[PDB]
Amino acid sequence: MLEKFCNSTFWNSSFLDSPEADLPLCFEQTVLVWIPLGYLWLLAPWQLLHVYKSRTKRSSTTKLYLAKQVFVGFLLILAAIELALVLTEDSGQATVPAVRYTNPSLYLGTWLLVLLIQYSRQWCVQKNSWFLSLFWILSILCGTFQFQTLIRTLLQGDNSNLAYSCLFFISYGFQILILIFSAFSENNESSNNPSSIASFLSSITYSWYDSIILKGYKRPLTLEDVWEVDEEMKTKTLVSKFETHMKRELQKARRALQVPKSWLMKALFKTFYMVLLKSFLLKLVNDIFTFVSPQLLKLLISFASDRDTYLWIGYLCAILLFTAALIQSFCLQCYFQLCFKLGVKVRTAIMASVYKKALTLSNLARKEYTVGETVNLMSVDAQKLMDVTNFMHMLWSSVLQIVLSIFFLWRELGPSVLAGVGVMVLVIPINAILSTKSKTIQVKNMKNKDKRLKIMNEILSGIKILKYFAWEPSFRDQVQNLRKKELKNLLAFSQLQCVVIFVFQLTPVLVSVVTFSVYVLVDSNNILDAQKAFTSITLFNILRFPLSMLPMMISSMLQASVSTERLEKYLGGDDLDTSAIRHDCNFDKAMQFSEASFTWEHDSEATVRDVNLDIMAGQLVAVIGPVGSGKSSLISAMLGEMENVHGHITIKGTTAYVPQQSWIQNGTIKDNILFGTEFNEKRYQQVLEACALLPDLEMLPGGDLAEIGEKGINLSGGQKQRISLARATYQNLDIYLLDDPLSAVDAHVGKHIFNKVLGPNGLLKGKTRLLVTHSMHFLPQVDEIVVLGNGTIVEKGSYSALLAKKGEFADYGLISSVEEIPEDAASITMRRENSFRRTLSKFSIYLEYLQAIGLFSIFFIILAFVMNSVAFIGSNLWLSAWTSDSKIFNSTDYPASQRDMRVGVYGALGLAQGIFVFIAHFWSAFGFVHASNILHKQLLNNILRAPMRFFDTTPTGRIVNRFAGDISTVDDTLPQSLRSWITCFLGIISTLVMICMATPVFTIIVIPLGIIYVSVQMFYVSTSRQLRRLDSVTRSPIYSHFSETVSGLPVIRAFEHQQRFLKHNEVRIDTNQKCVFSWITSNRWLAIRLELVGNLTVFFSALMMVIYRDTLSGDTVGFVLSNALNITQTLNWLVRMTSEIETNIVAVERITEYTKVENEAPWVTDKRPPPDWPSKGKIQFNNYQVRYRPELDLVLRGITCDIGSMEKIGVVGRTGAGKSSLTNCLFRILEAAGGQIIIDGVDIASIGLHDLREKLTIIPQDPILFSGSLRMNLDPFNNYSDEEIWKALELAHLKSFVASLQLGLSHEVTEAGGNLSIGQRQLLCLGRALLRKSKILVLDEATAAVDLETDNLIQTTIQNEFAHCTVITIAHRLHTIMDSDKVMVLDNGKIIECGSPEELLQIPGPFYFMAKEAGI
């Protein structure tokens, strides 16, 4: 072809048929040099015009840019020298070939272009791009052959082309060096985030993320240490981009109504097709290159089989086994980030779009959804869309992989392959049947789980009563009975989990048995050979994942079809209509009702009926009417929240509104006051003083910076009403709407605010005030009063105008998709579903967990697992010996006995691998369940044994969250992950042993490949663990914020703060985006580094086979290379589990922390008091001291007192009375410091608590009841009969009530006695004390909050029934101790006066001075 061009042959096939095979010189110097040259001139204008599109300010000329510019200048010099050398030299006898000087011409031309673009790249933000990085990469691979050809030719002594050779070597060396400089990013401070400044070789490698990994590992990582997301990923841009497509296409869907449906998906696709297209043209590259590894394996096996194949075939088939894997590696991760980033980019387009719809949504469309049913609309109902939008491509890519794998397998084995794929297909119904069976059992368990929470909250909140009455053994067995019923069901779930795992784990070795046995037995001449044997095993490790993860792509995709419907309904709702209410400035006065009629819903009566009313913009106006008759709707009428049927409302200026129920945000109390406007010291002091928040402010700890809201300190209705009024006043608006501002405030307090805030001289003189109330306290000062009747006004006038005329009417994080780890993609999906059900409602730690597991059972389980690896090793090794039969035994000469022997042994080895892996998982379930039985029991014992001091310090909510919100982790997620870790760490070890037994020298290479693997795992775990908790801590505020704005939405529209609240969500969502995307790259940084090690393991193994080809048999390379191709996927899988195990193991450590809590004195000691010990009340003090905390101070200073039988002891005090301390004193609740108290000749310290505690009675101030029933509440052990219980109820006068109940004692008591009134609950505690019938009664303010009639009843019952028992009474008021035989006075831990109240009153004493003559 190029005879007139090259003067030599273009291509001779004989050149490649020799051991010293070299490409023809003409072919390399022309064809392979145009591919890089043609790559530029074809695409050079495009990358030039696109650069010209973004004309920005050029950065300073960096040193690196100059170096990569002068060096290319040398290439211009070298190319020019070569052209001049060829032409200026005198040789005309032989005409120069065209190739000799034409090639410099393009090199002269192309380097001129490179000089131009490299300078023009400065204007762009990214100093390097795929246009130059690929060209340098492509000009080295194509130019390598010339470098090899010239070097080999020069080594032969032919120096005819020495001048060209030396110039080419320098040109080749500089191109390699230029590539090095092209991988370095020139810092120009365009943005703090390096993603937009990273060079191309640093953006398909993620070396720009190295800074965080290095920074995170050293010191703890914090929010400000993570760079903000790219400008495109910003939530402000995404909402606007999604808004245009949503609004234009929703109207199209509205036209089809002549409720819109099937409209959300058609909008999302039209908005992100530019990202979808880039993930489709690039996914095919991964699928095409994933079948190269098996196809290249056949070539390498054939090379080892024959001793005639040339050496260069092997090396070229080993380099290609690394290049075709690097391209697959870099492209696959460049797709994972290009598609997971779409998941984050689609949730933001919905999470930040529901909020904007929430403000504008009509309440009529909000009536159906509750508060909880709206908060979950994006925490679960929109997070369902991530997983669907995370990896859609398996809807088409999985179909492609199974269809292509079948074709390749059918091309190598024959029709018998259909039987093999049939077995894997038949697994899918087994998986589906087991999955839907496990879900039924799991969800049926959630009802028993939540019941334990209800009791668990119940026990801790009220442990004081539990310690007093010593009832905790009864509840301990009550919870254990519930837990035992729980654990019996849990074990069945674990059994169903050791089968799905066993079926899925065994399916790659069962298909091999079926496929090979049928192939060899169907026909005699079908001999098995290593070329067609191991090319099938490695294909079964490729087809397995698409055909096992496909069924979840049907359930999950269908699971979004219902989740989309809820999102479809909400976004499609009709927004509120503001045509009824007008805002204008031309209007003179403030208010105007033009025959307005209003109704709550369309199918309802009009609450407002045809009223004309006008108000001047200068006075206070109040509205008075009967409660529940067209009154509460009036305030909402001038707000846009209320529906209109016929009317015309106009309002001038801003409006301020105060609701009946108070909506309060979380944060400091200052934010709820200023409302995010400003902070004026003079104004702030005015509203705070006028609104009288000072009597509260000194009471909340932290002063004005207290944590208000559910997060911190809750407030009563009265304080909440004041805050809402204070917020409105500070805003300083025009019109104020008051809706019962003084409904729940104190009467005297209500006097204070009315006069000075909104009265004759209040700060609101210049602002109109509309007020509604039913209390007749203050309406003499109101400028104008309007009386409503039948929903309309009846009389208008002031108090003296017309009213005086008559006056008669007045988890799962770090795994974005199951695609990243297809080794076990099933257990991942169940883990997310466990989390979704939830949201709808160092080495010493491992040993501690393993000690909970039967340690004897551990050594057998690990023995079964390691024996499984041996069987796997034996099976593959035996298969290698089987394929050796083809060489020795000719076709049609294969003995039938030998054929039957081969399959028979392989069948048994398919069973030794089967019967052992099942006996390990099956025994894993019986062990992991037993751990939960022991671990939970330890917590329920020590915690119930914990001192009252322990509960006082730590919050109650902390313990509960660690009782079942943490136990769920140790027995749903931890057991399944651990059994899925050792089953893969034994895959890496098994694979490495396989290679080491073929080429022993390879084990040296393991050490560099072990240090790298450990270092990468160590770095990633030390960082991604921090990045996991840092996401959860910042994800919760988004959902928490939405609950506070959907509930307080009517207030928001009153102040027109919609725009401010939207911006609050933009920053709040963005802070989550900068964290979710922050580990996605951190997850990709694992894959590239580890697949680089996985590729190096395979590449360095193929060289060992190639080099040691004289001794290695052809079939031996099969089981060494077929099982090594799976090391790439297993290697990154192993590290991910180690991250999740190391994160979920903190749950066990937290449990152990409370299990080690210091424990009180033994319940039962060697001394048991006789029944006559509580027979008489002999209480004596011996200078006893008490201490709340062993380090603060001494509460008691050695009180000494003698108490005889029938001594009505009255103990009183003002400050530090120790009345609480005395209750903890007599019952051994606290520790004994310097004294002791002797009872009936026996010291309390000697007696065991449980025997001691039961023998006295106590009535707590707070009557907390129990949720079981009344029968168990009165008596947990229930040793008493029904007649005694009925008599006790009669004694407490509950007989008439309980007998009138539904079933009496069998009545279902709700939480905290929610079905019983406060006065009712205060009578149960008397019955509880009545049942004891013991001589000692300790009282502690049981009548501080009871009515007088019941108060007289309560003491009389104590006076009458316990007239035969010693009673010690504690009362804050001295009006209940005149009936006391002995009255005790003490202050700050020291007794003041001793004596009866009769003699105490005669002598003027300190208690007489402060309580009798001054307190009376």
Residue numbers in the entry: 1 to 258, 305 to 856, 884 to 914, 963 to 1537
According to the publication:
Bilirubin is conjugated in hepatocytes and excreted to bile duct via the ATP-binding cassette transporter ABCC2, dysfunction of which would lead to Dubin-Johnson syndrome. ABCC2 is a 180 kDa full transporter of 1545 residues that structurally consists of two half modules, which are predicted to be the transmembrane domain (TMD) and a cytoplasmic nucleotide-binding domain (NBD), respectively. Notably, ABCC2 also has an extra N-terminal TMD0, which exists mainly in ABCC family and was suggested to participate in the subcellular localization. Here we determine the structures of ABCC2 in the apo, substrate-bound and ATP/ADP-bound forms using the cryo-electron microscopy, exhibiting a full transporter with a regulatory (R) domain inserted between the two half modules.
In the translocation cavity, we found an extra density that could be fitted by the N- and M-segment of the R domain, in which only the side chains of the M-segment can be well fitted due to a relatively higher local resolution. The M-segment is folded into a short helix and a loop, occupying the translocation cavity, whereas the densities of the C-segment are untraceable in the map. The M-segment of the R domain is fixed in translocation cavity via abundant hydrogen bonds and salt bridges with the residues from TMD1 and TMD2. Specifically, Glu892 from the loop of the M-segment forms a hydrogen bond with Tyr381 from TMD1. In addition, Glu893 forms a hydrogen bond with Asn1204 and two salt bridges with Arg1205 and Arg1257 of TMD2, respectively. Arg904 from the helix forms a salt bridge with Glu1261 of TMD2. Interestingly, both variants displayed a significant increase of ATPase activity compared to the wild type. We further performed the transport activity assays using radioisotope-labeled substrate E217βG and found that E892Q and E893Q also exhibited a significant increase of transport activity. Thus, these results indicated that the R domain binding to the translocation cavity functions as an auto-inhibitor of ABCC2.
